[PDB]
């Protein structure tokens, strides 16, 4: 809840189940621990995803940012976590690092 991220999760368009038990805990950890998430896609789809997240596991200060589109097969979400804790809470060198991926948009390239 203090480590910053702006991780982007795609969301496909199944029949009536709207997530995956393959991918449910990984995409709920970010919405539980995030602070500002945004939703890009179809109008009623991002509406019911805001409803589903707020009714299932979110909290009352996320400030869901919705920007709807038209030609978007699927719906993509971006979960961000500003720190906003008053102790020290500084960013480590904006991660100019070849080992790690920078924690704004991961661009995960891995099998090994």
């Amino acid at each position: 809840k203090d480590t910053p991220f702006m991780v982007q999760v795609k969301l496909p368009n199944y029949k009536d189940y709207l997530l995956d038990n393959k991918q449910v805990v990984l995409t709920f950890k970010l919405v539980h621990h995030s602070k500002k998430i945004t939703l890009i896609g179809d109008a009623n789809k991002i509406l019911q995803y805001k409803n589903y997240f707020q009714a299932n596991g979110a909290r009352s200060d996320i400030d869901f940012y919705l920007q709807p589109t038209l030609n978007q097969k699927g719906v993509v979400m971006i979960a961000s976590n500003y720190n906003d804790n008053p102790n020290s809470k500084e960013k480590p060198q904006t991660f100019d690092v070849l080992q790690g991926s920078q924690p704004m948009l991961g661009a995960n390239t891995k099998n090994l």
Partner: protein
């Protein structure tokens, strides 16, 4: 954990209709036939068709 969902959707529908309005303006801007300022041989014929046609 609490349903609590109403009223925050008309703003979103306003956003959808604003993107719809932008798409309609783009579609309307895709034209080759309507008003576009041309040479005098085109434009005098144009103004004459407007005038004779308002009389018609």
């Amino acid at each position: 954990h609490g349903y609590d969902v109403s009223g925050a959707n008309n703003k979103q529908v306003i956003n959808e209709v604003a993107r719809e309005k932008a798409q309609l303006e783009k579609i309307n801007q895709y034209y080759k036939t309507l008003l576009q300022d041309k040479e005098q041989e085109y434009t005098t014929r144009k103004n004459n068709q407007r005038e004779i046609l308002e009389t018609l």
